[PDB]
């Protein structure tokens, strides 16, 4: 399952098309896949976080 979404009230780093915007709440915390890119995805949780599992 998704142990943590790390989404509520926080926005993380999302590098796409050469510009790294901050939106869509793509936070995650697990060792399933794309672990190396997890650093880039979670490179800017600038705002306060509030975890909540999706039980995926």
């Amino acid at each position: 399952e998704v142990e943590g979404v790390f989404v509520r009230a926080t926005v993380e780093r999302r590098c796409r098309a050469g510009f790294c915007f901050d939106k869509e709440g793509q936070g995650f915390a697990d060792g399933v896949l794309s672990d190396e890119q997890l650093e880039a995805l979670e490179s800017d949780p600038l705002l306060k976080v509030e975890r909540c599992t999706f039980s995926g």
């Binding site: 943590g4 790390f6 976080v49 509030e50 975890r51």
Partner: protein
């Protein structure tokens, strides 16, 4: 500075003195890492715990980064004169002077040091341990460790700093004799108000790692690059660095 002592004939001119007040604000810097509270205890090799204290090392390295970033900006940034720190049109009272890979010739023994830093506040350690923040009760078991900094560099003296070199060592007449010795002559020819010299004594040479060997050749070996000569042997001691470029 005072006007030069002039000749006396019939009466004394009650001269005046200028002032060049320089303004520069402060900037704030921080670096923080979010970690899980449970994970730091859930370890047996003594790792993932010293990382929170590594913010101390980061803060210790910060002032060098700030000073050398300002050094990089030297060409872009402006000094008290209102022109760029390394500019070819520095305004002197009667006329205009000029001091413009990543070079810089600086004095070290003067009462002022170029690119002076400002350790306004210490490397205070900011932490998020337990019942001190809401990140750990009404939130996940998250902890952040941060190092606050409230420092900034300064463009101190743009009339004693020289940059924009084709730094080279060859032929002892065209590459070094016309660039590094040109900077030597320009720095030692600087004139203050009234036409007096500034007593500029270039003794610091700062260059990135790419120019380290060639700077050592300019200062350290009797022959420059062809067996002709090296007039600049043991005149300016070079300190290597990598924070710039």
């Amino acid at each position: 500075q005072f006007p030069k002592l002039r000749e006396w004939i019939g009466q004394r001119v009650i001269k005046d003195m200028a002032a060049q007040g320089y303004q520069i604000t402060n900037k704030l810097f921080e670096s923080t890492v979010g970690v899980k509270r449970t994970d730091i205890e859930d370890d047996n090799l003594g790792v993932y715990g010293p990382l929170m204290q590594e913010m101390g090392r980061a803060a210790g390295a910060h002032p060098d980064e700030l000073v050398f970033a300002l050094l990089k900006a030297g060409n872009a940034n402006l000094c008290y004169d209102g022109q760029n720190f390394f500019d070819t049109d520095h305004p002197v009272y009667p006329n205009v002077d000029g001091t413009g890979f990543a070079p810089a010739a600086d004095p070290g023994a003067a009462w002022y040091l170029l690119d002076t830093s400002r350790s306004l506040k210490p490397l205070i350690y900011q932490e998020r341990m337990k019942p001190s923040f809401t990140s750990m009760t009404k939130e996940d078991d998250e902890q952040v460790f941060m190092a606050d900094e409230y420092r900034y560099g300064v463009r101190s003296r743009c009339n004693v700093g020289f940059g924009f070199w084709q730094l080279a060592a060859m032929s002892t007449e065209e590459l070094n004799q016309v660039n590094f010795e040109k900077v030597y002559d320009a720095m030692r020819n600087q004139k203050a108000d009234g036409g007096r010299p500034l007593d500029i004594r270039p003794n610091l040479l700062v260059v990135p790692t790419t120019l380290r060997s060639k700077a050592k050749e300019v200062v350290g070996v009797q022959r420059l690059a062809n067996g002709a000569d090296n007039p600049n042997f043991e005149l300016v001691q070079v300190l290597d660095t990598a924070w710039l470029n």
